[PDB]
Amino acid sequence: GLKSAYKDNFLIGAALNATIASGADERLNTLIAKEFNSITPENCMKWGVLRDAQGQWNWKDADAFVAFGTKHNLHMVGHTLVWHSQIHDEVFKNADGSYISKAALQKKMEEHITTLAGRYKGKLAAWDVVNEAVGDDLKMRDSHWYKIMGDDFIYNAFTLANEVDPKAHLMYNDYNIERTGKREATVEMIERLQKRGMPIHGLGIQGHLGIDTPPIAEIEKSIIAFAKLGLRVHFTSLDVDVLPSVWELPVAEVSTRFEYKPERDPYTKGLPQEMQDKLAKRYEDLFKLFIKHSDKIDRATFWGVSDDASWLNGFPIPGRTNYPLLFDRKLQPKDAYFRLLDLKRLEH
Ligand SMILES: CO[C@H]1[C@H](O)[C@@H](O)[C@@H](O[C@H]2[C@H](O[C@@H]3CO[C@@H](O[C@@H]4CO[C@@H](O)[C@H](O)[C@H]4O)[C@H](O)[C@H]3O)OC[C@@H](O)[C@@H]2O)O[C@@H]1C(=O)O
Numbered sequence: 001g002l003k004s005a006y007k008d009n010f011l012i013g014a015a016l017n018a019t020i021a022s023g024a025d026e027r028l029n030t031l032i033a034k035e036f037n038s039i040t041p042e043n044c045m046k047w048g049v050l051r052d053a054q055g056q057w058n059w060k061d062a063d064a065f066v067a068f069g070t071k072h073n074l075h076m077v078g079h080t081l082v083w084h085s086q087i088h089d090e091v092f093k094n095a096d097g098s099y100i101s102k103a104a105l106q107k108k109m110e111e112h113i114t115t116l117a118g119r120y121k122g123k124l125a126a127w128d129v130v131n132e133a134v135g136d137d138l139k140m141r142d143s144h145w146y147k148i149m150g151d152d153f154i155y156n157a158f159t160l161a162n163e164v165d166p167k168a169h170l171m172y173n174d175y176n177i178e179r180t181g182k183r184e185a186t187v188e189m190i191e192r193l194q195k196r197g198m199p200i201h202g203l204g205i206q207g208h209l210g211i212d213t214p215p216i217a218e219i220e221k222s223i224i225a226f227a228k229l230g231l232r233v234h235f236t237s238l239d240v241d242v243l244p245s246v247w248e249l250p251v252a253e254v255s256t257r258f259e260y261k262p263e264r265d266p267y268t269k270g271l272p273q274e275m276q277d278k279l280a281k282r283y284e285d286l287f288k289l290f291i292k293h294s295d296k297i298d299r300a301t302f303w304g305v306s307d308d309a310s311w312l313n314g315f316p317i318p319g320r321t322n323y324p325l326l327f328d329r330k331l332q333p334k335d336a337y338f339r340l341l342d343l344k345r346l347e348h
């Protein structure tokens, strides 16, 4: 399978949802053990999912994930300690809407990281310590984390994770850092945190790609730039959106562009062969680039195993039929999978 074809290059990973990680699905257990040598929990280790609004913890799914990776001797990536999404407003705010103090939030961060990274110390090889801290306007993301703490939210998160599990490979992770603008903003941020002495080992490029954009040349500039920081590069959340895009619409449509419209969901009956071809070529281009820079890259993780479970079926438009991954809704390899294998089978 893929993990073997790519053994000399980098880990091949998949994000697993709670149903899959339960181990109840023997077909998927077989597929995963064959194809992947790394896994990431799709949701169950996110603050707002693992803990309720009162801060109470329920370990059922997170423990099942770690047991699944242990059972199959898979490399495991914790996702994610400090992020502005899927986390209760109660972490940052009094019930009246006012923010708590930096000191009060620091205490909560300390408890969360010490508990979560502590529980799985030595079991998870790597952590996404901070996710998505640069805004799309190229300034620091205006999250509650940042408004309350400043860049100390990042510095302290990494320092804490490193104290709790000194052996964990610590990563900063973000999307659209494949692109000019956000790439350079991220380099600048990381550079200066590193100089300040922040422990950090890896840089995660999410790799939520379109069927066309961004171009290989842009992704290449990012691999090279982030490697120059003395960080291992990981592609962490790979998928290829094949459906009509709403990211670039006229101002009149800004509000309604996330509305379900039949014309925006054109492949409910199946993805036609011509698009299978385009998808295969796009993945082949991508993996050619990864092979080229294999010396810089530790891992390529897909954000899901098969199309039926992809978050792109519901994002950014609910209820679409997307085709973003290497296995179809019947768990059969798509044309893209075979192109990926051929790149290695036939390597000179
Ligand atoms: C309220 O938060 C919003 C974010 O502001 C928004 O960026 C988005 O965040 C998602 C993230 O979505 C990215 C957005 O960018 C896409 O890339 C575009 C492709 O078309 C090109 O022409 C554009 O130039 C590109 O920007 C990319 O495909 C998406 O994946 O994905 C990662 C998520 O964790 C993050 O939430 O959406 C959220 C939101 O609505 O929740």
Ligand SMILES: O[C@@H]1[C@@H](O)[C@H](O[C@@H]2CO[C@@H](O[C@@H]3CO[C@H](O)[C@H](O)[C@H]3O)[C@H](O)[C@H]2O)OC[C@H]1O
Residues within 6 Å of the ligand: 042, 043, 131, 206, 237, 303, 311
């Ligand atoms: O109804 C809830 C859903 O809203 C929720 O969707 C998850 C949102 O997060 C996605 O993963 C992110 C994808 O983008 C980046 O790569 C981030 O780093 C990822 O965390 C999940 O794939 C979706 O499943 O799921 C929970 C549910 O209760």
Ligand SMILES: [Cl-]
Residues within 6 Å of the ligand: 016, 017, 018, 019, 042, 043, 044
């Ligand atoms: Cl899940």
Ligand SMILES: [Mg+2]
Residues within 6 Å of the ligand: 070, 122, 123
């Ligand atoms: Mg172990």
